[PDB]
Write a protein that binds this ligand. Sequence first.
Ligand SMILES: [Ca+2]
Ligand SMILES: [Ca+2]
Ligand SMILES: [Ca+2]
Lengths: 73, 143
Amino acid sequence: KFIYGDVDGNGSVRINDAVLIRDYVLGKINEFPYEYGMLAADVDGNGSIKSIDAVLVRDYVLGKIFLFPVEEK
Amino acid sequence: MLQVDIGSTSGKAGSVVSVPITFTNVPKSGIYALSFRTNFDPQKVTVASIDAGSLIENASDFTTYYNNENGFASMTFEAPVDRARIIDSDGVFATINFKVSDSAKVGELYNITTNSAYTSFYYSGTDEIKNVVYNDGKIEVIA
Ligand SMILES: [Ca+2]
Ligand SMILES: [Ca+2]
Ligand SMILES: [Ca+2]
């Protein structure tokens, strides 16, 4: 059903998901193009969408990590 | 259509070779974001370093990583939100510097291939560049 990091709801975590988060944090856009986008976007799991969320999604794409902080323990 | 070439080269066992990643026929409307991941056999080559190419105007836009255990090298570009810098012209995006194994044999040919799951190109935050064509890379071991 939803995947952490996938804020556009296409089924894959990609670079544009990171940039959507970033553009949301910066106030360039005001929502995500996906009904579970807000849920998918809070990948550090601290309850808000912040610059670090976009960095963590980039790190997923780079292959630095497989699990997001929201997913561990 | 955007053409993305992993370059080919040749080198001897134990040397460092350079594999540039070249973009041709870049759309005039520009690339706002991309990721590019190459796979390789880490028993044959390892990544020594990745350098920004001349398409990268500001290093804060460009991030890289590699894993010599599982065999991939990744690169990302993210344009600034005000679109002050955008890749809208042709050139070298990045160069991967590969170390050829000490046990490499003359006449072996190693393949550097595009990983489609972790590679994508975007006009904007929502619109993918869909018809990109990719050409993988060859490293030939010579004497
Ligand atoms: Ca997505
Ligand atoms: Ca968060
Ligand atoms: Ca090629």
